[PDB]
Design a protein around this ligand. Structure first.
Ligand SMILES: Cc1ccccc1CN(c1ccc(C#N)c(Cl)c1)[C@H]1CCN(S(C)(=O)=O)C1
Length: 243
């Protein structure tokens, strides 16, 4: 068993393929919102089997899923684009793949999201590294006052940091593996800035949804309404690997 047990578990609990259910701006945005609803459901289900997560206070579980909703979607988009289209298209779902031609306005945000699959291609991120990084992304922001289950949270983060180091070790050399840890963790740090612009665009679109004729499903609407205003206002503590 060359592949470490926890990485193998993460492989098995990965979501199955998620379809958007999918051509104008409002219809494209509505289809992306419909995908976002299904992605949110899949993340909550995933979190139920994620080792360590269910042992956190339920308030912290909800908070962490809501905080990391956008980040986990765009990180998953990065993987699928990388895997299916060599990072040269945005593979939101099998029934929703976007190239330049299908971006007209929104295009600017698509270009910034596009930076992630490009870094995956550049770094040649392995599935084992991706799966550990994904868990760290879920645990990458906390409230200003911390979590109720802070001690449990810290231990879990450390466990998946240690697992990421194992993941890197699968493919030699103390200097190189140390350099690769910096690169992958700096990628995660850099996502905070990218997701800020995605959060802002989302909240703006949510506010103007009636005028734009864009439907926002109920579960993802609650995340947007409940959390994005205070996240954008800076009422959370982003965690960073590098100061
Ligand atoms: C913020 C943004 C920008 C471009 C394309 C998509 C998004 C975000 N979305 C999104 C949906 C699914 C996935 C996946 N997988 C991703 Cl990464 C983003 C959804 C959720 C909110 N919007 S919006 C602009 O109407 O508020 C569409």
């Amino acid at each position: 068993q060359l592949i470490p047990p926890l990485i193998n578990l993460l492989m098995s609990i990965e979501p199955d393929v998620i379809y958007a259910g999918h051509d104008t701006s409002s219809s494209l945005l509505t289809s992306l919102n419909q995908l976002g609803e299904r992605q949110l459901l899949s993340v909550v289900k995933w979190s139920k089997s994620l080792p360590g997560f269910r042992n956190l206070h339920i308030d912290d579980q909800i908070t962490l899923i809501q905080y990391s909703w956008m980040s986990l979607m765009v990180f998953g988009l990065g993987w699928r684009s990388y895997k299916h289209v060599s990072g040269q298209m945005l593979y939101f779902a099998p029934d929703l793949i976007l190239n330049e031609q299908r971006m007209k306005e929104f295009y600017s945000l698509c270009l910034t999201m596009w930076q992630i699959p490009q870094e995956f291609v550049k770094l040649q991120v392995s599935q084992e590294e991706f799966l550990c990084m994904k868990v760290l992304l879920l645990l990458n922001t906390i409230p200003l006052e911390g979590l109720r289950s802070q001690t449990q949270f810290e231990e879990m983060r450390s466990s998946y940091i240690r697992e990421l180091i194992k993941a890197i070790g699968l493919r030699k050399g103390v200097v190189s593996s140390s350099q690769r840890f910096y690169q992958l963790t700096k990628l995660l740090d850099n996502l905070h800035d990218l997701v800020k612009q995605l959060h802002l665009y989302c909240l703006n679109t949510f506010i103007q949804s009636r005028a734009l004729s864009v439907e926002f499903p109920e579960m993802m609407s609650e995340v947007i309404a409940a959390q994005l205003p205070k996240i954008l206002a800076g009422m959370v503590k982003p965690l960073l690997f590098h100061k």
